[PDB]
Structure 1
């Protein structure tokens, strides 16, 4: 397993514009287009993202290209974030993927706010971080996914995804 496969499992793949768990327009593999309620606004961002008149639909290749870009951007954002980098640097490979997953979902700013959890992860206090992480809106809103990610931090294995 690897980060791509992990995220493809968590986000799925949709080739037509759709609304995410929060009601926002998205496309592909969890690529958020806009938080605006307007579908036209969404089609416009799509077109801008793809570089053609899409009319709300993408091909598999195009969606995978957005995904590649989004994963890359996620890693890069972590490595440039003062609160995040040190955490990520301290982790083993599997766990780093768990961190990336979270930043892809919630943004780096959103993850950088789990201060308490981050410290625990940095200290390698797995069970404790797992419990702290669960005390969040994130876990209450998307519990199955949060649970997989959390298990991943807790165990350092991919069992949650097998």
Structure 2
């Protein structure tokens, strides 16, 4: 099994939320979202880091405007998606729908699945 040093840490979850709040490229879209779509954003920041997610300007813009389909289509074109497509497809469904369909849940259990 995984080393204890390599497991999911609640504090790293909290670091992702802090990172969102203190980045003007992230907090406005987070604030605009419902709780389930917020979990998708937390996941993405947890995985690739604050700076990286803040680079997704076009797609976050779409999310902030409730343009769910356009956001999902755009996110699936990224290098991120092609790197980790199973995970990205789950996160994208969560952004698109505001449901846990892709995990059938809460942010911790979502990450517990995605981190493996």
Give the TM-score band, short-chain normalised: 0.7 to 0.9
Q: Which runs of 5+ in 2 are unaligned?
A: 105-116
**Structure 2 CA distance, aligned partners of 1:114 and 1:74?**
16
2:69 paired residue number? 127
The offset of 1:69, in angstroms, is: 1.0
TM-score, length-normalised on structure 1?
0.60
The offset of 1:63, in angstroms, is: 5.2
The offset of 1:115, in angstroms, is: 0.2
TM-score, length-normalised on structure 2?
0.83
**Structure 2 CA distance, aligned partners of 1:61 and 1:67?**
12
Cα displacement string for residues 15-72 of structure 1 (whole angstroms, at most 9, x for unaligned residues) = xxxxxxxxxxxxxxxxxxxxxxxxxxxxxxxxxxxxxxxxxxxxx9955986111001
The offset of 1:143, in angstroms, is: 0.5
Alignment RMSD: 1.9
- Higher alpha-carbon Rg: 1
If asked which structure has higher relative contact order (CA below 8 Å, sep 6+), I would say: 2
Count residues in correspondence.
Answer: 103
Q: 1:136 to 1:64 in 2, by over 3 A?
A: closer
**Structure 2 CA distance, aligned partners of 1:63 and 1:127?**
38
Q: Which runs of 5+ in 1 are unaligned?
A: 1-59
The offset of 1:141, in angstroms, is: 1.2
Q: 1:114 to 1:64 in 2, by over 3 A?
A: same
Cα displacement string for residues 82-113 of structure 1 (whole angstroms, at most 9, x for unaligned residues) = 10000100000000000000000100110001
Cα displacement string for residues 100-143 of structure 1 (whole angstroms, at most 9, x for unaligned residues) = 00000100110001100010000000000000101110101111
**Structure 1 CA distance, aligned partners of 2:6 and 2:37?**
23
Partner of 1:158, secondary structure, is coil
Partner of 1:82, secondary structure, is coil
Partner of 2:8, secondary structure, is helix
